Amino acid sequence: MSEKIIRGVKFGVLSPNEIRQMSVTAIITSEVYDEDGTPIEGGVMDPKLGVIEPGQKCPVCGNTLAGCPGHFGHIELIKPVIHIGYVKHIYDFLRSTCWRCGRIKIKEQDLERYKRIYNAIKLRWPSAARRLVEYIKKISIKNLECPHCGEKQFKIKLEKPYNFNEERNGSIVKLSPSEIRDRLERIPDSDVELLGYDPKSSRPEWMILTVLPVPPITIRPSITIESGIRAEDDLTHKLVDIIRLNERLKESIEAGAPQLIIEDLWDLLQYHVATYFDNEIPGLPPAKHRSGRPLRTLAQRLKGKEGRFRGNLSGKRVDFSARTVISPDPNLSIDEVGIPYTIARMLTVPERVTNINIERIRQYIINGPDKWPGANYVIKPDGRRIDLRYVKDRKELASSITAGYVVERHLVDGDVVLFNRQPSLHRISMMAHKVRVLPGRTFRLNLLDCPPYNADFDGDEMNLHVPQSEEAIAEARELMLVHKNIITPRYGGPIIGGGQDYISGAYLLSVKTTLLTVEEVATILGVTDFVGELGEPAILAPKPYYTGKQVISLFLPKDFNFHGPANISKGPRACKDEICPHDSFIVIKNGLLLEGVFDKKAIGNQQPESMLHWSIREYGTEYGKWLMDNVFKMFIRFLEMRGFTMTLEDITIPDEAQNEITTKIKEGYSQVDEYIRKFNEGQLEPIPGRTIEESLESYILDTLDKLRKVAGEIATKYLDPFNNVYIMAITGARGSELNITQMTALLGQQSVRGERIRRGYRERTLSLFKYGDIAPEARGFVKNSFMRGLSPYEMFFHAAGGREGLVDTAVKTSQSGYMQRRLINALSDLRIEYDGTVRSLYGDIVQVVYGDDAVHPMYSAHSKSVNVNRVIERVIGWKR
Amino acid sequence: AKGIVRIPPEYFGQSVDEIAIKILRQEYQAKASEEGFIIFGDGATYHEVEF
Amino acid sequence: PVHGDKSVLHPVTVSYAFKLLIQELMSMVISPRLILGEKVNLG
């Protein structure tokens, strides 16, 4: 005998004889127990079916719960009943065959040709075979006579749920399961396989129930919750109801009674069987046991998101895992996670003792479960476990171990774990991290690791899993490490990169006017691992001064060249070449930063074709990780060495600006009033293709938008060109031009669903305005700023405009989840073969070559096989 | 006869023949291939033997 | 359960939820038969 694997599953309909022969007992009695005697013979709780309480031996097999599979029973039904789930099939078995001779009502020769074609095409073209059988069924149903026996056939109409009423030249006759089974028993095997069925495994008369299988107790365990009487589940109650109806019908028919009550009781028994197979039958009253609640049956046992498929098969609860709130930690590497001591001493990893790591494991064993690092259990080679909590003296036990033992030690530094944040939209939402144990109670994540997880520290929690096998750990370390996944697969560009304080610090350190003394340089460089020769100061006299670019240049490789603009080169700083009075153009030659600043366009995350992107692409994720660990901390250190605050004086504008804003607003209002006044007397030439009352709204919206833009420009011009808010806006750290415009100048026009606010009273939004007023103020134009403050109706209009954001989020996330689930299930089984083709696991070909040139998006230079201009730059950029 | 013999990793570094014979005659109650394949979840090597 | 002692049985490791699914499928009239295969791939 050999250990095997599951290679396939063959389905079918379970034969009544097979049910009889697989069963161990026959259920005869109708009481579940007597005087709490559940081992009562012949009941549903007969011990021969199975055992569920801890201490007991199964009568059928001398095994306990550890090795006792459930055993099935059989109930001999006296009146045949029909399966509710199979009705449609037997429906197609009634309208497509003769009632008397039990044969298909298609003539002989064409039927033989059809079956020959079907057998010749059944396996190669399953869809064509399905079309053929459906066509045969359609053309056989529409025949009212049987050529084989020369008899005239009536028609049968289906009535929900399970009763078939045939028409027989008037006086519609209700059909009984016995005659239906007799009719279906006559269909030959050669004709039942022509209809798309299997005679040797799914025989139609087996589809009519004569013997019912009784599931074991292991499938329907008795629950003794609430510290009271044991509460049986729905299956036992429905089964015993079916049994008692069976004996009632048997005794009633054997005693003699009118056939009307007999058939009514037969219908009731059929109802019990149907509600046992499935409770939520449309148009039927659900069964309720004692509390007026609908029962849960076999169909309900496999349904929803809490059933078997989506509750215990597709997804399941696993151990060796934890969930905890996350907090920032900029002192960790980009592939490290900080865990508390309590979790480290609870989750363990099993390490097998060898001749190389025996002293370390002995030291682990010497420390108890309560001392870190330590161990919790020791597994002997025999397979028995020893708990270190109850060990009398583990000091000698540590010396007693040899190679072959297994020790469950605590998590230590350098251990590989899986770190995850739901909803897990894409593949890098779950990554392999290295453990570091720190005091506290939260998981610690580096600030650069947030974008892949889409996490921010507003109270989010994340999950941690500990692989427990050598192969799983090796795969996680070699394929799922964080630093190996800097570039996202959606496009060619880094997903891990500079955030918000990093960009501001980089800009402030890289600017032309930064000069540092020796002590300041030492303080800045003390946070990194750099030690060595600083070189001569950039400025020698009168006072020895370094510079920000010189400190930055200590980390770039000595053959790196880069020419490109910065994020601050959008406004009046655009010099479009190397001769720039501003630091608006980046020039790096042979690893020396000669001019330009660092901002979002040089170190920012999700910025393809930046200097960070090329640096990673040319010096590996190794240099990418080293750079992100070293140079990104000087930015924070210099930011806190300098001062970075936000004062209210960065938003206030001088009173001379407010007068110009007011004049512009008055001009715009006068223009709108002129439009409206001339609209009331015709005098308007509408935009071609548009009607009156549609051109007026367009004119008003256009002039209001132009007024908003002009006011924003005026506010920006008269503000301080170098303040913290403007710096954050231009460098791309936080904010935008629109936010600055709204804070310093007028908010603009509020709109709901792309149109001005109109819902309210008749011909007016609020009761503060005149009837039929379409002035800019009356429809939601805010002429104030957040700094200046809003009037009450402006507050109302702002809230009305902004309400949509609080609503759209749930709809968006639900639709995205549904679409992604369908798309995943559609594209799950595709693979790339060794010849470059894209093929499904079933063999068929999707693409002759992946993409068009077999290039991975992750390894591409922003959706491009290779940037030839970048190569020319990399070669000869030091002499451009 | 033709069969498959499993060689545990602890017996590595030695010629296949004697180990193959040892496990063959150890539990039953020959030129084996010098190379064998590895399956998922087990480190032992499976060799084809003509015994 | 049907062949008694006239058949050879093989052990397979599997998720217990799958075995529960098989058992509750046999509770209905569906009969799922598992086809076994060799653990070791010959060649």
């Binding site: 050999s2 | 006869a1 033709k2 069969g3 498959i4 013999v5 032992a44 | 060799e38 070791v40």
Partner: peptide, 7 residues
């Protein structure tokens, strides 16, 4: 551990 022995 399997054999797949045949004669």
């Amino acid at each position: 551990m399997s054999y797949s022995l045949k004669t």
